[PDB]
Amino acid sequence: GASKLRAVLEKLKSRDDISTAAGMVKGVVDHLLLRLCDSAFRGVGLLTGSYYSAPNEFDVMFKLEVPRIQLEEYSNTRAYYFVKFENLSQFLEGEILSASKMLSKFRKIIKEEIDTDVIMAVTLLISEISVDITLALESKSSWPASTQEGLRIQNWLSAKVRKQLRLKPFYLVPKHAQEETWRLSFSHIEKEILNNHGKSKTCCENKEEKCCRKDCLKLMKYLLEQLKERFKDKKHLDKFSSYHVKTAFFHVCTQNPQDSQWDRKDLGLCFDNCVTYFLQCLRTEKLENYFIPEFNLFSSNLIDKRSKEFLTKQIEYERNNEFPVFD
């Protein structure tokens, strides 16, 4: 029953509709970067606008190079940190850097340069299409000791690649934990190891090496969004996001490191295994962050078992009926 999934893939490929709309966004973003003329946002750049069933919604991240940072871990929560440190000290509240103040001037300088308006990091609605903008510090120092045993790809993309990827800078993003904390972000690494997906360097570059990894992730996200929309009336699925399903997908990738276990003929079986693993994470309330292995996205402190037991029930019914949410 894999043709119904490829029929979904066929309809999912809204290909030109996102291509023509991204040009309108490119102007707004390029017309946003010049105005942050600010001393505070001098070295601000971006991180190819992403688009996680909604071709009219975008999210771009604005990198801000911050040199000579030093991080204090919050409270054994290995993903949230305080930031310490030719000098810029407006938001420097004592020694910790005020995330709320630093985000306020970011919202302020952006609201000045903006049928384009702003909603309550930053979302806008141009020409009636929305763009989420995110502020991120860049630290070219070594990755925090909380990441050392994460990104277990040595058996899949090789240890030589993992050492190379950990040479790259990491990113911190304002995110409360109960406030004034920044969270570790490796979205750039996620982009890297998704477009260089295979164990073979020529994977998917020829008909004999066509795998179904990207297609499995796309259906995982599509399944979640469809059910997130179907049950919009209640809020049981509001705490789930495509970051969870893509983190689970990465754990299936390190579990099945060979390209032979991802042949496009076995798309139905491979996707069935991807759905099976995501359900196991739901029931056991365990899905470690791919880069911070001690950070549990599915801990009871973040999502309650009632909402996971609801998501599990919906997915189990879907798999047992050839996924009607696709119809």
Ligand X SMILES: O=C(O)c1cccc(NC(=O)c2nnc(-n3cnnc3)[nH]2)c1
Residues that bind a second copy (CB under 8 A): 154-155, 157-161, 195-196, 199-202, 205
- Binding partner of 255, given ligand X, Zn ion, a second copy, none, CB within 5-8 angstroms per partner class: none
Q: Which is nearer to ligand X, 139 or 289 (CB)?
A: 289
- Count residues binding Zn ion (CB under 5 A): 5
Pairing of strands 70-73, 170-174: unpaired
* Binding positions for ligand X, rule: CB under 6 A: 79, 184-185, 241, 243, 289, 297, 302
Please tell me what DSSP assigns to residue 290: S
142 is in an annotated binding site: no
How far is residue 135 from each of residues 81, 100, 138, measured CA to CA in Å? Answer: 16, 12, 10
Which candidate, 262, 138, 144, 147, places its Cα nearest to that of 197? Answer: 262
Q: Which of residues 183-202 bind Zn ion (CB under 5 A)?
A: 197-198
Could you tell me if 6 and 212 are in contact, meaning their C-beta atoms sit under 8 angstroms apart?
A: no
Q: Which of residues 205-224 bind Zn ion (CB under 5 A)?
A: 211
251 is in an annotated binding site: no
Q: Whole-number minimum distance, CB 214 to a second copy, in Å?
A: 14
By beta-carbon distance, which residue lies closest to ligand X? Answer: 241
270 binds Zn ion (CB under 5 A): no
Which candidate, 115, 11, 127, 137, places its Cα nearest to that of 58? Answer: 127
- Binding partner of 211, given a second copy, ligand X, Zn ion, none, CB within 5-8 angstroms per partner class: Zn ion
Pairing of strands 57-65, 130-139: parallel
Q: Whole-number minimum distance, CB 202 to a second copy, in Å?
A: 4
- Binding partner of 100, given ligand X, Zn ion, a second copy, none, CB within 5-8 angstroms per partner class: none
* Token reading at 249: 């997908």
108 is in an annotated binding site: no
219 is in an annotated binding site: no
DSSP bridge pairs for 132: 59, 123
132 is in an annotated binding site: yes
How far is residue 326 from each of residues 113, 162, 191, 226, 290, measured CA to CA in Å? Answer: 41, 36, 26, 8, 28
Give binding residues for ATP as ranges.
50, 57-59, 187-190, 221, 242-246
